[model samples]
Target: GSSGSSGALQAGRLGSTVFVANLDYKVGWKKLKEVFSMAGVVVRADILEDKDGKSRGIGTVTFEQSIEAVQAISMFNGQLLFDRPMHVKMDERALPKGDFFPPERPQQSGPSSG
Candidate 1:
C-alpha cells in the first residue's frame, strides 16, 4: 500500500500596499471596512468578480501602512468576518497572475473589422 496524501501548501509575500482580495461573495464593496477596521485603519476596500470560475468570488482591502497589514493578516487572516473566516495574504503586487490570463500571442492584436 502507498498513501501519502498530504494537504496543499498556502501562498504569501509582502510588497504591494495597494491592492487586496477575497470573500467577494459574502463581502461587498460599500461597507467592507466594517470588518477590516477591526485590525487597523483601512484605506479602502473593494470586491471583484472571480470570473476565474474556479473560485466562487473575492475582493480587496487596502492599508497603506505595512504595519496595518501585519495587524490585518494575523488578526483577520483566519478571523471570521461574516459567514466565513477571512483569508488573508500580502499582495506581492505580482504583475499578471499568470494562470488568471495566459499570454495568447506574446504580442498585441488590434481591431481590423468593421
Candidate 2:
C-alpha cells in the first residue's frame, strides 16, 4: 500500500541518493533539509558530524526514491553551492559498482552451465 516501497523501480534505475560532500563548516543539516526538501520528501538528510558533533563539511541527502535523486543531480550537478559545486549522484554501489575489475578476471558459471 506504500507508494514508495511498492512503486515500480525500473531496472538500472537512473536515480539514487545524493551525497553533497566538501561542504563548508557553516553548512549544517538544517540548511540541507531546506535545499533537498524542494525536490521531494527527503527520507534522510544529515551533515556528517565529528566526534564533537561539529560539522564535518560532508553530508548526504537521500530522497524517498531514485527519481528525485536523479533530478537533484541534474539540477545541482556542477552547480556551486557556497562556492563548492554540488557533487550529486546515485549513492555509490554498496559493494562493487564503483570498483573496476581486471579484464583477465574469470566469468562465473552456474553448475548447470558448467
Candidate 3:
C-alpha cells in the first residue's frame, strides 16, 4: 500500500477538481466559477450548501485541465478573497484501505465474537 503517489502529486495530475474552503458565506457558485476562470477554462463550480440552502464556506471547482487545477491551488490558495483567505487542495477521493495506522474499523461484528 506504499506508493510515490502518496508522497506528492506532481503537476498536471489527479482529477481536475479542487476542494476550496474559507470562502465567504455570501459567495455563490456563479461568481466562484468566474473567480476560478482566471487560471483556465472552468468546467463547473459547486457551493456546498446545506439542506436549507445556506452556504457552508466551502466549495469545489473543476478546471478543464488538471494543470489548470494545479495552477489554481498555487495561484489562488491562501489568497485573500471576500475578506477571507482561501484554502485549495486537490479533490482526490481517498479509497478505503485497512493499511492505515490510526483508527482501523472494528472487525466485522459477526466474524466470530468468541
Candidate 4:
C-alpha cells in the first residue's frame, strides 16, 4: 500500500517500485508495461521465476511514483493480469525465498557409515 516510502530506497530519490505477485498465469512483461504504464512512467518490468527461465506466474512492475503503483494496483489487480488473478501490493521484504534442491545429495547412507 505505502510502497515502502520508509523502506527500499529511503535516501535514494529514484522514485519507488512495487512487486506484484501471483500475476495472471498468462501475463507477460509487455502487457504488464502496457497496463501499468497508464498509471505512470514504468521504470522497469520483469516477470521473475526459476533459473530455467520459467514463468512463476509472478513479476515486478515498477512505476516512477508510488501513486502510479497504487493506480496500477487498482486497474490491474484482479483484472486478469496475464490470464490469472493478481495480488498487487507494496513489497517490504525484498529477500527471496524457495529453491529447488538438487534431486540427490552425496549418497550418505549404505556402506559409508558402517
Candidate 5:
C-alpha cells in the first residue's frame, strides 16, 4: 500500500502562483479574484494594467496552496472569459531574491588625503 499523503506530496510538488492570459481588457483585480475564487482560496489575484489603467489581457493568481492552484488550472484553463478562451498555467518563473527596496549603498569609503 502506498502512503496516503499524496495530497500533501502533490501540494509540495507545485507552486501556488499561476499565469492567466486571454483575459478581458476591462477586467480588474477584484474581478479576477472573484472568478478564480470559485476554484480555490485565492491568496492573490491581479490583472496587469498599463500606466493609463488598461488591462493587458493577462494576469496572475496565487492560491493559498499548490493544491488549490492545480484545481484552478484544471477548472479554468481554456475556459471562456469574456467570450475568449482563458489560458492558465503554473507560473514557473522564479521569484526575485532579496529585498525589493534594497538597502542604501554603503557610504563610499576611501583614504582621506589632506
Candidate 6:
C-alpha cells in the first residue's frame, strides 16, 4: 500500500496488530487511536477495559501493514504518553495455519437440571 493515502488499507498485511501496555489508565480507544495515527494509518486501536469501563493499562493497535506496525512499535515503545512509557510489540499469537475450523465442544451429560 502507498504511504500517501488518507484512508487506511486493510488486508494484505502480516502481523499488523501489536500489543501495547503501560499506558495511562485514563486513556480511551479514541485517544489511543489518535496517538498511534502519527506513526501510521491506524486500522484500529482499543484498550482493554474492566466491567466498569476502566482501562486496564493495556491495549492493541492495528496498523495498515507490518511495516507500519513495526514503525509504530519502534517509535512509540518506551516513549512517554500521558506521563507513562508505552510498551509496544508485535502480538505473538496468531490464528492456526491453513483451512482452520473451530473444534466442537463436548456436550454436557447432565446440565439441564436448572
> How large is the C-alpha RMSD of every model relative to the true structure?
13.9, 15.0, 14.8, 17.5, 15.2, 17.9
Better of 5 and 6 by lDDT: 6
Instruction: Write one digit per residue (lDDT tens) for candidate 5, span 13-102.
Output: 346789988888777788888888987899877777778877778898988867888888988978987788989988876454353685
Which 10 successive residues of model 5 have the least lDDT summed? 5-14
Candidate closer to the true structure by TM-score (higher is better), 5 or 6? 6
State the lDDT of candidate 4 residue by residue for 68-101, as single tens digits: 8778777766776435677776656443325447
> Candidate 4: what lDDT?
0.71
Of the two candidates 3 and 5, the one with more favorable lDDT, higher being better, is 3
User: Model 2: per-residue lDDT, tens digit, 53-89?
Assistant: 8776678887876677777777767768888766665
Error of 2 at 3 (Å): 48
Ranking by lDDT: 3, 6, 5, 2, 4, 1
Clashes of 6: 0
Check candidate 5 and list the clashing pairs. none
Span of ten consecutive residues with least summed lDDT in model 3: 92-101
Residue 102 CA error for candidate 5 (Å)?
30
> By TM-score, how accurate is candidate 4?
0.59
Candidate 2's TM-score reads 0.60
Candidate 1, residues 1-114, lDDT tens digits: the string is 768777854355553343334464645666567666766777777665546744344567777567876787777667666566666777656433343666587677898988
lDDT of 3 by residue, 21-107 (tens): 888987889888988998898888888877887887889898887788888888997989878899998887632335547777868
Off by over 4 Å in 5: 1-13, 51-53, 94-114
Candidate 3 whole-model C-alpha lDDT, 0 to 1: 0.82
lDDT of 5: 0.80
Tell how far residue 93 is off in model 5, in angstroms: 2.2
Cα lDDT for residue 76, candidate 3: 92
Clashing pairs in 2: none
